[PDB]
Amino acid sequence: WSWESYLEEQKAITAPVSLFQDSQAVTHNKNGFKLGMKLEGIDPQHPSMYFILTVAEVCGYRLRLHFDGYSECHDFWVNANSPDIHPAGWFEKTGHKLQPPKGYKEEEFSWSQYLRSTRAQAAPKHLFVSQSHSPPPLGFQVGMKLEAVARMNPSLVCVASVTDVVDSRFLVHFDNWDDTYDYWCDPSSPYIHPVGWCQKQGKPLTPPQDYPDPDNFCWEKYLEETGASAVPTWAFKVRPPHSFLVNMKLEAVDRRNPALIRVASVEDVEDHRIKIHFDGWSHGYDFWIDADHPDIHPAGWCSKTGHPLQPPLG
């Protein structure tokens, strides 16, 4: 099974490499991670928290991460060029807090001792794209407020704060709302707006949870109450809409079993998101995803990275 013949057969076209951020397209970097190596990384489900992680599996340019001491049903995949993982000792040097592996207390964890008691190695520093050596995102500092879209199913534009900054990105948090809604962005995200955007758009702004007298939430009053400043307008450099067109083919990670990447097709589009359909499967599986999501790639990504591509259901 090659893409050449599948295109010839379906009389289809692939989404050009130029439509992808090149972190989604780069295939020539070597994956240096090895089974057993230990490191630090955020919990996808709680992006504001850091844990000790172990490389559970290596496949192509990807790897499965395991929360030391916890159940294997929490393992998740990332690409080797993921900005959400860091080398051992990162949190300490960056002043971040670490959630100790199951069984330890924050006051009894030292990499030195830990590696020795587990007879393991820390993944070398030269594998991580993110280890705080980069220039912070311009104009976005911890404590600043803004309006951002929360994937609350359905989505809402809520009052939010920058609660963490790492290298070139920041973490958006929704005031007094559940932690799990946080997400890392950069200044060009299409989901963030400056304080006051909603009012100027004539849209409803969702105030903090249980904020007294929600109906009359007032940004100026709130910034006064918190002493927080608003992310300055100039800092927002929203990116242009993507140019993926319907029917273009590409490769996407199966979110029913992320260990697998299938042949995919653009089913529909919006300004910043595309709808994935896995060739040969029901449409019940279609799903929307941001155009810059790290789990979609140009055709041939698997082959070039040594990862198995699942052909359309035959």
Side-chain angles (χ1 to χ4, degrees):
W1 194 110
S2 68
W3 273 99
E4 194 184 303
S5 56
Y6 186 62
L7 290 191
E8 292 297 293
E9 173 194 304
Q10 303 291 306
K11 317 281 155 203
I13 59 159
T14 63
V17 162
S18 67
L19 304 186
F20 297 84
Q21 295 312 313
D22 51 70
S23 56
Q24 295 167 308
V26 62
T27 63
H28 59 48
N29 297 338
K30 184 180 177 62
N31 186 338
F33 285 89
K34 300 300 179 178
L35 188 76
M37 293 185 157
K38 295 197 184 296
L39 55 141
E40 298 170 12
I42 68 167
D43 167 353
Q45 298 312 312
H46 295 274
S48 78
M49 286 165 88
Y50 299 95
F51 293 80
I52 302 305
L53 307 170
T54 302
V55 171
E57 199 189 331
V58 185
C59 185
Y61 201 57
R62 310 176 71 217
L63 45 145
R64 177 162 51 102
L65 293 177
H66 170 69
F67 291 89
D68 280 50
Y70 294 106
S71 173
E72 188 184 54
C73 56
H74 302 96
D75 287 37
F76 61 96
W77 301 74
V78 301
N79 300 138
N81 66 346
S82 162
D84 302 304
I85 52 174
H86 313 285
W90 175 88
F91 73 90
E92 176 176 55
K93 107 159 190 291
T94 57
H96 286 278
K97 179 166 131 84
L98 173 84
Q99 300 313 312
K102 191 65 165 302
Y104 290 39
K105 302 178 189 294
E106 192 167 303
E107 47 159 341
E108 62 178 55
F109 175 82
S110 67
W111 270 112
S112 198
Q113 166 270 152
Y114 192 67
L115 291 168
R116 198 240 317 300
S117 70
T118 55
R119 293 163 296 272
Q121 327 266 329
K125 300 177 180 176
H126 72 279
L127 303 176
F128 306 81
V129 300
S130 183
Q131 47 194 312
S132 293
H133 284 8
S134 299
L138 259 60
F140 284 87
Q141 297 198 338
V142 173
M144 293 188 168
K145 304 288 195 182
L146 69 160
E147 310 190 337
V149 187
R151 253 68 74 193
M152 302 183 142
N153 194 2
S155 301
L156 293 177
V157 177
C158 310
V159 164
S161 307
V162 173
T163 54
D164 196 348
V165 173
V166 170
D167 277 303
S168 187
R169 295 142 59 245
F170 52 92
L171 179 55
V172 179
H173 172 76
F174 299 97
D175 294 26
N176 205 53
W177 286 101
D178 192 64
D179 168 77
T180 68
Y181 293 120
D182 308 341
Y183 56 86
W184 293 85
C185 319
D186 64 284
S188 67
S189 172
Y191 295 105
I192 63 181
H193 306 294
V195 166
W197 189 78
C198 279
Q199 191 201 75
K200 296 178 189 175
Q201 286 318 97
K203 296 193 186 307
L205 175 66
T206 294
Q209 186 159 43
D210 329 311
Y211 180 76
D213 183 27
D215 284 314
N216 296 311
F217 173 80
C218 165
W219 259 127
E220 183 179 44
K221 228 90 289 175
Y222 189 52
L223 296 172
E224 181 177 302
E225 297 178 307
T226 59
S229 63
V231 174
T233 302
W234 63 265
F236 299 88
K237 303 175 185 303
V238 67
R239 72 191 62 151
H242 67 75
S243 287
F244 281 89
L245 306 174
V246 172
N247 302 153
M248 287 183 158
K249 295 192 179 300
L250 67 166
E251 299 173 10
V253 176
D254 190 308
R255 49 194 36 232
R256 275 177 69 86
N257 158 31
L260 301 169
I261 295 165
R262 304 179 171 302
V263 169
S265 289
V266 179
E267 183 60 45
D268 192 17
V269 301
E270 304 180 328
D271 286 336
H272 309 291
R273 308 192 308 165
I274 61 169
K275 188 185 187 182
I276 303 291
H277 167 68
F278 294 116
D279 291 34
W281 300 77
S282 168
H283 268 242
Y285 299 128
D286 292 354
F287 61 99
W288 287 88
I289 193 177
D290 291 320
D292 66 332
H293 192 282
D295 287 326
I296 51 177
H297 310 274
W301 188 80
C302 287
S303 163
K304 297 184 182 184
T305 60
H307 187 108
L309 179 62
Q310 297 311 304
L313 187 51

PDB file of all heavy atoms in Angstrom, residues 279-281 311-314:
ATOM      1  N   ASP A 279     -10.849   7.086   5.929  1.00  0.00           N
ATOM      2  CA  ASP A 279     -11.241   6.365   4.724  1.00  0.00           C
ATOM      3  C   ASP A 279     -11.603   4.898   4.970  1.00  0.00           C
ATOM      4  O   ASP A 279     -10.780   4.108   5.453  1.00  0.00           O
ATOM      5  CB  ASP A 279     -10.119   6.439   3.680  1.00  0.00           C
ATOM      6  CG  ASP A 279      -9.938   7.832   3.107  1.00  0.00           C
ATOM      7  OD1 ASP A 279     -10.140   8.815   3.846  1.00  0.00           O
ATOM      8  OD2 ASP A 279      -9.576   7.945   1.919  1.00  0.00           O
ATOM      9  N   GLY A 280     -12.843   4.544   4.633  1.00  0.00           N
ATOM     10  CA  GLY A 280     -13.301   3.173   4.794  1.00  0.00           C
ATOM     11  C   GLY A 280     -14.096   2.883   6.053  1.00  0.00           C
ATOM     12  O   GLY A 280     -14.591   1.770   6.232  1.00  0.00           O
ATOM     13  N   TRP A 281     -14.233   3.874   6.924  1.00  0.00           N
ATOM     14  CA  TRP A 281     -14.967   3.685   8.165  1.00  0.00           C
ATOM     15  C   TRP A 281     -16.240   4.501   8.166  1.00  0.00           C
ATOM     16  O   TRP A 281     -16.449   5.336   7.285  1.00  0.00           O
ATOM     17  CB  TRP A 281     -14.094   4.085   9.359  1.00  0.00           C
ATOM     18  CG  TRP A 281     -12.842   3.284   9.438  1.00  0.00           C
ATOM     19  CD1 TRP A 281     -11.716   3.439   8.679  1.00  0.00           C
ATOM     20  CD2 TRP A 281     -12.618   2.135  10.261  1.00  0.00           C
ATOM     21  NE1 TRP A 281     -10.806   2.451   8.973  1.00  0.00           N
ATOM     22  CE2 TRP A 281     -11.336   1.636   9.941  1.00  0.00           C
ATOM     23  CE3 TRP A 281     -13.377   1.473  11.234  1.00  0.00           C
ATOM     24  CZ2 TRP A 281     -10.796   0.499  10.565  1.00  0.00           C
ATOM     25  CZ3 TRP A 281     -12.840   0.342  11.854  1.00  0.00           C
ATOM     26  CH2 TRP A 281     -11.562  -0.129  11.515  1.00  0.00           C
ATOM     27  N   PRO A 311      -4.081   1.391   6.428  1.00  0.00           N
ATOM     28  CA  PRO A 311      -4.778   1.708   5.181  1.00  0.00           C
ATOM     29  C   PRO A 311      -6.282   1.767   5.432  1.00  0.00           C
ATOM     30  O   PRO A 311      -6.764   1.342   6.485  1.00  0.00           O
ATOM     31  CB  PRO A 311      -4.383   0.559   4.266  1.00  0.00           C
ATOM     32  CG  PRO A 311      -4.265  -0.579   5.216  1.00  0.00           C
ATOM     33  CD  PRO A 311      -3.498   0.039   6.367  1.00  0.00           C
ATOM     34  N   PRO A 312      -7.042   2.316   4.476  1.00  0.00           N
ATOM     35  CA  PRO A 312      -8.493   2.393   4.676  1.00  0.00           C
ATOM     36  C   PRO A 312      -9.085   1.003   4.914  1.00  0.00           C
ATOM     37  O   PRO A 312      -8.571   0.001   4.404  1.00  0.00           O
ATOM     38  CB  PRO A 312      -8.984   3.043   3.381  1.00  0.00           C
ATOM     39  CG  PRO A 312      -7.955   2.620   2.369  1.00  0.00           C
ATOM     40  CD  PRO A 312      -6.662   2.768   3.126  1.00  0.00           C
ATOM     41  N   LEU A 313     -10.157   0.939   5.699  1.00  0.00           N
ATOM     42  CA  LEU A 313     -10.785  -0.343   5.999  1.00  0.00           C
ATOM     43  C   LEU A 313     -11.174  -1.079   4.722  1.00  0.00           C
ATOM     44  O   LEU A 313     -11.961  -0.572   3.921  1.00  0.00           O
ATOM     45  CB  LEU A 313     -12.019  -0.134   6.877  1.00  0.00           C
ATOM     46  CG  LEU A 313     -12.670  -1.414   7.404  1.00  0.00           C
ATOM     47  CD1 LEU A 313     -11.616  -2.308   8.063  1.00  0.00           C
ATOM     48  CD2 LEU A 313     -13.767  -1.046   8.392  1.00  0.00           C
ATOM     49  N   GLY A 314     -10.617  -2.274   4.541  1.00  0.00           N
ATOM     50  CA  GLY A 314     -10.899  -3.061   3.350  1.00  0.00           C
ATOM     51  C   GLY A 314     -11.950  -4.149   3.500  1.00  0.00           C
ATOM     52  O   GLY A 314     -12.607  -4.234   4.567  1.00  0.00           O
TER      53      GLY A 314
END
